[PDB]
Amino acid sequence: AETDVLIVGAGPAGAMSATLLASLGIRSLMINRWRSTSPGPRSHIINQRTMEILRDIGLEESAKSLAVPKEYMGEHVYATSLAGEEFGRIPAWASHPQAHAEHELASPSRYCDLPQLYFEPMVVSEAALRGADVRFLTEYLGHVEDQDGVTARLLDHVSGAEYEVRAKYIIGADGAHSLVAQNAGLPFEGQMGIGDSGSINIEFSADLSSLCEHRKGDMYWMFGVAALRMIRPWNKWICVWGYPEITKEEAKKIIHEIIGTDEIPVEVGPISTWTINQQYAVRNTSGRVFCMGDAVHRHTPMGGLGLNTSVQDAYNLAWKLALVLKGTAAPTLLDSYDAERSPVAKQIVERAFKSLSTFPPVFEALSLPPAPTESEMAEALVRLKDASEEGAKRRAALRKAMDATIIGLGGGHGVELNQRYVSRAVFPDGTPDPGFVRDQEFFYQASTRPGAHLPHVWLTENQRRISTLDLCGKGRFTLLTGLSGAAWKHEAEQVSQSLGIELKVCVIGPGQEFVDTYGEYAKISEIGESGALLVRPDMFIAFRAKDASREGLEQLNVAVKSILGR
Amino acid sequence: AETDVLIVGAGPAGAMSATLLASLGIRSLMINRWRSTSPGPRSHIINQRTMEILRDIGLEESAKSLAVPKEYMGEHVYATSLAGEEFGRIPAWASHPQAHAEHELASPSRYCDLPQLYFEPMVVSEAALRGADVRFLTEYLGHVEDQDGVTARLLDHVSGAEYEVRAKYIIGADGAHSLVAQNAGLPFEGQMGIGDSGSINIEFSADLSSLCEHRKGDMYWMFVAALRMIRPWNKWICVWGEITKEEAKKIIHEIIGTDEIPVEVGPISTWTINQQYAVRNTSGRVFCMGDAVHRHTPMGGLGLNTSVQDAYNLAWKLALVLKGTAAPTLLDSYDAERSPVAKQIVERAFKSLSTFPPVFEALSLPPAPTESEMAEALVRLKDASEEGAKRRAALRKAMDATIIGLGGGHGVELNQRYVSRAVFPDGTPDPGFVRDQEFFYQASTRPGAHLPHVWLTENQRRISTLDLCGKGRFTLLTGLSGAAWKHEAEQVSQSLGIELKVCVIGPGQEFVDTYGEYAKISEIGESGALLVRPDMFIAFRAKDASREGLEQLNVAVKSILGR
Amino acid sequence: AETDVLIVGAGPAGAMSATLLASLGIRSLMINRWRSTSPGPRSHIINQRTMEILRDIGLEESAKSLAVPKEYMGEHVYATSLAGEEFGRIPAWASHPQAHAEHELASPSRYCDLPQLYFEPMVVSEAALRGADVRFLTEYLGHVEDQDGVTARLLDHVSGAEYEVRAKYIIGADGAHSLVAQNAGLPFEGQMGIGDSGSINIEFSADLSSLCEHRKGDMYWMFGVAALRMIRPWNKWICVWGYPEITKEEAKKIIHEIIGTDEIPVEVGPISTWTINQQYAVRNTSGRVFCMGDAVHRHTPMGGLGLNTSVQDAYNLAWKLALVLKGTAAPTLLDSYDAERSPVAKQIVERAFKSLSTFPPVFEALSLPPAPTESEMAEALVRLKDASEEGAKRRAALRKAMDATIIGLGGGHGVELNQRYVSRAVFPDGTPDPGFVRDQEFFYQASTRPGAHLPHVWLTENQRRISTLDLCGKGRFTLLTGLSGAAWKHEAEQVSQSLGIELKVCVIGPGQEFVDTYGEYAKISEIGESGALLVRPDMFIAFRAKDASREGLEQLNVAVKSILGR
Numbered sequence A, C: 001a002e003t004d005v006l007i008v009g010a011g012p013a014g015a016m017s018a019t020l021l022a023s024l025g026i027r028s029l030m031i032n033r034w035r036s037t038s039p040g041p042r043s044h045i046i047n048q049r050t051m052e053i054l055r056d057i058g059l060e061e062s063a064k065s066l067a068v069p070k071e072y073m074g075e076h077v078y079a080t081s082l083a084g085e086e087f088g089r090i091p092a093w094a095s096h097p098q099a100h101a102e103h104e105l106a107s108p109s110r111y112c113d114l115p116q117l118y119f120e121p122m123v124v125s126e127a128a129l130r131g132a133d134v135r136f137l138t139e140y141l142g143h144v145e146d147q148d149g150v151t152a153r154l155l156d157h158v159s160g161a162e163y164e165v166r167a168k169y170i171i172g173a174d175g176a177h178s179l180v181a182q183n184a185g186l187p188f189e190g191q192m193g194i195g196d197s198g199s200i201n202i203e204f205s206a207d208l209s210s211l212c213e214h215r216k217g218d219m220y221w222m223f224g225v226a227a228l229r230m231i232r233p234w235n236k237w238i239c240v241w242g243y244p245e246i247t248k249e250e251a252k253k254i255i256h257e258i259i260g261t262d263e264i265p266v267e268v269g270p271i272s273t274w275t276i277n278q279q280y281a282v283r284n285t286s287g288r289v290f291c292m293g294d295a296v297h298r299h300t301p302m303g304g305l306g307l308n309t310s311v312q313d314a315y316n317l318a319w320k321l322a323l324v325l326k327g328t329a330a331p332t333l334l335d336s337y338d339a340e341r342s343p344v345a346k347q348i349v350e351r352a353f354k355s356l357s358t359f360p361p362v363f364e365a366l367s368l369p370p371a372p373t374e375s376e377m378a379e380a381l382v383r384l385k386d387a388s389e390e391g392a393k394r395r396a397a398l399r400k401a402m403d404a405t406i407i408g409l410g411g412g413h414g415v416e417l418n419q420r421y422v423s424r425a426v427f428p429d430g431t432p433d434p435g436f437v438r439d440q441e442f443f444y445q446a447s448t449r450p451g452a453h454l455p456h457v458w459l460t461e462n463q464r465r466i467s468t469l470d471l472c473g474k475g476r477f478t479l480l481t482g483l484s485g486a487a488w489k490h491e492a493e494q495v496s497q498s499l500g501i502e503l504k505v506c507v508i509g510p511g512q513e514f515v516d517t518y519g520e521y522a523k524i525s526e527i528g529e530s531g532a533l534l535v536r537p538d539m540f541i542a543f544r545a546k547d548a549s550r551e552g553l554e555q556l557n558v559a560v561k562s563i564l565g566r
Numbered sequence B: 001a002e003t004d005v006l007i008v009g010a011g012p013a014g015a016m017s018a019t020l021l022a023s024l025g026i027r028s029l030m031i032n033r034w035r036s037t038s039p040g041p042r043s044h045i046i047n048q049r050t051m052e053i054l055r056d057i058g059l060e061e062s063a064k065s066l067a068v069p070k071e072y073m074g075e076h077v078y079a080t081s082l083a084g085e086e087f088g089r090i091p092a093w094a095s096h097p098q099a100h101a102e103h104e105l106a107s108p109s110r111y112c113d114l115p116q117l118y119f120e121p122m123v124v125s126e127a128a129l130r131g132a133d134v135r136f137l138t139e140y141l142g143h144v145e146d147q148d149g150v151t152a153r154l155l156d157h158v159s160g161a162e163y164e165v166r167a168k169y170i171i172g173a174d175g176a177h178s179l180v181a182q183n184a185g186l187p188f189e190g191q192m193g194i195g196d197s198g199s200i201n202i203e204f205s206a207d208l209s210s211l212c213e214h215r216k217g218d219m220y221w222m223f224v225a226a227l228r229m230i231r232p233w234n235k236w237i238c239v240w241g242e243i244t245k246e247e248a249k250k251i252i253h254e255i256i257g258t259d260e261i262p263v264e265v266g267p268i269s270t271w272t273i274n275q276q277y278a279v280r281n282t283s284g285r286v287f288c289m290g291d292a293v294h295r296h297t298p299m300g301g302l303g304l305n306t307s308v309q310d311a312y313n314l315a316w317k318l319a320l321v322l323k324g325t326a327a328p329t330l331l332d333s334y335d336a337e338r339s340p341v342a343k344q345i346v347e348r349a350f351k352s353l354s355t356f357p358p359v360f361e362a363l364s365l366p367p368a369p370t371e372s373e374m375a376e377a378l379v380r381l382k383d384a385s386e387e388g389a390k391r392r393a394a395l396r397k398a399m400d401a402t403i404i405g406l407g408g409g410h411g412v413e414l415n416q417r418y419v420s421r422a423v424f425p426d427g428t429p430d431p432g433f434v435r436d437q438e439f440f441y442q443a444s445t446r447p448g449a450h451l452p453h454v455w456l457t458e459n460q461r462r463i464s465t466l467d468l469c470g471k472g473r474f475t476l477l478t479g480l481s482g483a484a485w486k487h488e489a490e491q492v493s494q495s496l497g498i499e500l501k502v503c504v505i506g507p508g509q510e511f512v513d514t515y516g517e518y519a520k521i522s523e524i525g526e527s528g529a530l531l532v533r534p535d536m537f538i539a540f541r542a543k544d545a546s547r548e549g550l551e552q553l554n555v556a557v558k559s560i561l562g563r
């Protein structure tokens, strides 16, 4: 064989890497040990960043067609059982109108719900169509790096044959027990994630629309706490509880109990179990090897950051491998992938873990031990309807405990969006880091300073709304300015012809192709009309100039050469 | 010939009074000079207060049918012509996502567009169906007050007969030239406007969906004439601040910018406003409301809305006094509570006008261009120069500032603050508005404020705090630890002969603080209570269920009723 | 390697075969020469039979999510150009209310529009998930049959390796130049399909919603006639015209002309060409080899019968291979696949061709030659607005010509649905063949006589509508009767235990699981309440008894043994 990039793993990080590279005309071979895309729904939250990526490569409309929408997700119920009495609800996934506004303001895209079961084949099939080579039932074994590329060994689970593939780079997208990460010798940290613990799932099928229609939610959590998650509303489900476990048809009895009733016909599907050693890689890159996805960040599902961060890892790297492979960028461009993605890997493992500690106080508020007998809980239900002042303090205590769980259920908007990149890939503009005015995990803060994601606002094109994001992306640098910065067009042209690099310039303003109709661009840009922002193929601002002066203009070339390592 | 209340006027203010009175079992006679309801679309913005009133009387679901919802109203375009180039847009009627959150947090109800052409008949039929006698083609001529009621003289425009009506009260809802306001001798304070001039409106049909559907707005202003939607997107009205031929379709063709679409000119009418508010709305047995007491500009569309709210304030009061449950002094809070609103909404409506000249100044246009000055300005606006960018920034600033009259005045719409004998103070100081009080609603539970909206649940279904309340009766809201309120309410209800529904909100209860938003908005302890008037306003707040706290309910209610 | 069934080809016939077999627990290996599912939209009509199959294996809801619906398809415009003047319209795809009723009455499912581009990966991904082995970049070469199975040779386009796979059967789903059909020596007929002719496609992207919104159609045909087909409304398209052809950016000029205007921005995508030798196989089976799809019927797109007939070939065979592979059926069960599917192969090639002849009379009515100059056509437009009686006869002539094209554009409901099976697989009940009361190509006729598809009507289950079809299918024979035929339950039980075969019985009636609420079952069944219908895994009736008499009961066993070849 022979390819430019061997992509080991076909899950979200791998499927997305192959699609982006193929879109960029890079030859890739993605492999996967198993028969299919993944049997389980697993990962189901899709945050705005991953829906932006889908938008940029034209797959958002598909994603949206197969995905429950945000209006079905909001009602997070805490209760005894599905048919029993609620303790309370919380506005999950930004359903609170203030949350929703903060959400809608931050991006053109929105939260949906799309199980991995569906997400994966949609991306794998697209990578193949875009020209990536894809090959399942192929079980990576190892590799040997030399100065000019790599030579890993493959075991073919159909033929029984074994073979070699010569590449230039290897992406290790191979999941939570990355053999690619072991062989590249990646150091891992923060392993003290509370005694290694798993969870046990249990798919089933029942029409509980009579218990869900009037209160539409992504999830329904019973107090040992067990979650009822909607695969498809409202006939498909899955029960979770915190735990190699075995269960029979006796799981049907657990479900009925969870439903609080035994009179909807149930149909028990597959039963899996999950385990996690919570860790992150301190570095994600070794020589020609680059790991991503679960391969470098392993954690709890709290916040559903994994799949989303996994795809964003792929979006960071792809255009960089493509530029280097084409000789338009030095290989040192590739150093920033660790510089930018590794701090995201630690932050999300740490955040996902920290959310687990928001749940014991729910039990403490009701004066219930870690594990409560049925008489114990039934008594806590009684204490809670007590007409005394102590019953008040108690109802207030539970409300406060419940509210605090939201950080893990749609409240971490800051965590999802607040990426801040420091690297060679990002040319600093001399301004100091401004801060987050509000808590940076809870609330997103838009920034146009180099290192931040391009902020969303609406422009219009033909009197139709277009996002600032839809101007950019597509495996090509974009320069945004206004009428008074007309010189940018020429400066960009010189820089692009000389550096052999595509750089689209958009002069936003009246009578232009794109118009700052609502004035929201002037508002969000942080700089004069004549200033420019340079936006990387991955939506991040890498260069910012305040005006169109000669010294501002002269600096574009220095920044692009610097970004490219030339 | 004999009724308890004679309502003069069948516009929004009159029809609403009749409907509420009738709903309350009070005999009324509502009259109207003309043949029909108003044939003009006129006022169309329905704010949340009016939609709340509609919901309370079960008419919310109806209006909404015949309503254009908020999603169609947002895109306010400023342009040269409809098919020409936009200068820019502003997010009108709370369409900016932050405005929208503030809007939706403030109420169960939402902005809609429902022309008065449709609103009126919807309410006049309900007034008639609910028990009210209604009788158009009948002109109020004058009346004479005496000690026991009033005698009007009516002029039947079908018979030529003239007769008398005896009534215990008279509502003057007879519009911008109230004769009822003149004869009652109500004082008016000016004095805004130079001098007292009107506008011209032009109805017309035309299929304009191809210029409106990708940019859904309530309104499209051209540089100043407004092109306002009646029905999306085929029915219309062209306004601008006489005599006009039917062949003024020209002016329309040019305002919409093309002439390729068939246009069918309907009626052409003129509106003249003399900006004034009554200092007092009440004289003896005469109570004025609507345009009769506040005459003003359409900036902000506060006028139909504040006109209905006048009716919602007065009705349950007339009914309680007519029933003898309440003393006649209870009526005194009508002027104390509604007159300050009447001066506030004229002044506000007028002040918005002055946000428009700065648009022309940004354009460096003369107050009124001529010809190629309006073409030249556009060129300056596209100027690559640094002064051109100052011009664009200046144009943007001027535009943004017009929002105060186009959905921005949420505070104005909602921040009612009543001080009177019908509001029983709880001893706390007036909290301030943390933010600007014209732009931003501030929720309050302090007596004199409207009951705050938040969502509880009933049968795991969302219900608003507002739905528990009103319905022509006083409501007391408390929590589980406030169990005693309900005995106390029962004792107060028998001793005074007045309905007081008590709702104990909590787990296991009929209504549940499912999201905990009530504990959060309440402001008091779970065992505190809030008393809400039939008109959704809080008149008594207790901080807990202590014996001192319990004891005060009966003093408050007696005090609210004048007894 | 080693599998029970080697499936050569991964298009609709192959992807559907692998999904059904995997659903039935049969080990399959499906291969495909190329990188991906097919780049082109191609096949886009989905008729009711293929939407029934999708329903039965639980993929209809997916199919429906990614598919334009019938309400967008109806307006078939004939015109000069898209922005020019229409000649007239016809109610395509059963949009006429009478057509629509006949349509809705015939099935629980409906016409949609779903390009192959999307349909294929949705089925391939499902086959893999259901446990079929799938392997692209694998290029069948040949095989050698012996008495116990087959041994074909494979060429691996990733490794360069070659290898053998031992199977029991081979399905030849390998398209219009079936190497599997050549090697099995299948005779082909009806090749005189008018001098071999092709067509030339031309994908593009433009927002012509302003010309389409008000008249929603699947297609817009210009008069050389060139068709504007909607890939996605209304931004995606493709231009066709009847023709190895080459075109440049000069195709953009053809498009603009077809649009009649050059002011919507266009974006020219890929340009392919199609060619067809119209033929059908006289037999589809040779020893252990079974061909299906284009492999046995090659034809024009008129009526869009290919993809739909292709999938139905797979649905006929799968459950038969599974029963034989499990030893519950003799191998002679497999003889009926040719007996039932081959007459469908000839009928559809012949029908698809015959539709082409409905188009010249449109040109003849307007007195235009085969190929008309621009002055010629412009003159025909003039003649057509002539205020004379000869202008009348002429407008009437064109209306009649246009109406007659509908047989190829949604009018052939009889062709789509009127399958009549005669074979060992179908146990005859002694009644004569009743006939079609109306034209059997135009109008569907429901039949419960053995050999016909189970008729659709609505029952209810929990007061919810359920189709008679939803009772049946699932790789298991089903027996439908009513309360007075209670004996069927026991007779079925004896027959099933002794024959080692699953046979679900449904006793439809009041107070039962399924209820003849509307009485439409009594109406459609053609037999007493106590009669039974036996329905094959593929929805076809194989046995019909008129009542529950002892002789009726005694015959079930004879029929099932006979169907199974035992």
Ligand SMILES: Cc1cc2nc3c(=O)[nH]c(=O)nc-3n(C[C@H](O)[C@@H](O)[C@H](O)COP(=O)(O)OP(=O)(O)OC[C@H]3O[C@@H](n4cnc5c(N)ncnc54)[C@H](O)[C@@H]3O)c2cc1C
Binding pocket: A008, A009, A010, A011, A012, A013, A014, A031, A032, A033, A034, A040, A042, A043, A044, A045, A116, A138, A139, A140, A141, A173, A174, A175, A176, A179, A272, A273, A274, A292, A293, A294, A295, A300, A301, A302, A303, A304, A305, A306, A307, A310
């Ligand atoms: C059982 C389970 C349940 C989960 N539930 C949730 C949940 O409820 N919520 C949530 O937020 N997250 C959940 N997750 C986490 C989740 O599925 C992801 O984080 C995501 O799938 C990981 O992305 P990758 O693309 O980074 O991982 P992967 O999807 O695991 O991709 C790894 C790929 O590499 C392949 N591979 C591995 N080794 C080799 C090899 N040696 N050679 C060739 N191929 C190889 C694998 O087969 C696979 O194709 C769950 C994970 C699992 C396993």
Ligand SMILES: Cc1cc2nc3c(=O)[nH]c(=O)nc-3n(C[C@H](O)[C@@H](O)[C@H](O)COP(=O)(O)OP(=O)(O)OC[C@H]3O[C@@H](n4cnc5c(N)ncnc54)[C@H](O)[C@@H]3O)c2cc1C
Binding pocket: B008, B009, B010, B011, B012, B013, B014, B031, B032, B033, B034, B040, B042, B043, B044, B116, B138, B139, B140, B141, B173, B174, B175, B176, B179, B269, B270, B271, B289, B290, B291, B292, B297, B298, B299, B300, B301, B302, B303, B304, B307
């Ligand atoms: C032509 C016109 C256009 C308008 N356009 C707008 C607009 O675009 N936007 C906006 O916000 N507001 C607009 N308004 C303001 C508006 O219609 C209201 O503020 C509202 O109608 C006033 O309510 P009332 O119910 O208070 O007034 P009215 O609707 O005028 O009700 C008065 C009633 O009393 C009756 N009446 C009067 N005299 C007698 C009598 N002597 N005897 C018996 N009955 C009598 C009248 O016939 C009428 O039925 C417009 C008003 C007019 C006249």
Ligand SMILES: Cc1cc2nc3c(=O)[nH]c(=O)nc-3n(C[C@H](O)[C@@H](O)[C@H](O)COP(=O)(O)OP(=O)(O)OC[C@H]3O[C@@H](n4cnc5c(N)ncnc54)[C@H](O)[C@@H]3O)c2cc1C
Binding pocket: C008, C009, C010, C011, C012, C013, C014, C031, C032, C033, C034, C040, C042, C043, C044, C045, C116, C138, C139, C140, C141, C173, C174, C175, C176, C179, C272, C273, C274, C292, C293, C294, C295, C300, C301, C302, C303, C304, C305, C306, C307, C310
């Ligand atoms: C370019 C084109 C345009 C078309 N347009 C239309 C249209 O507009 N309307 C319409 O109704 N129909 C159209 N069709 C017809 C259509 O696409 C089908 O009838 C259908 O795809 C055929 O089903 P199969 O599943 O029977 O065929 P195929 O989709 O062709 O499946 C054949 C499969 O076998 C593979 N294969 C072939 N040989 C080998 C081998 N030696 N080894 C391994 N694998 C092999 C192929 O790669 C492919 O995966 C078009 C066809 C083509 C080719």
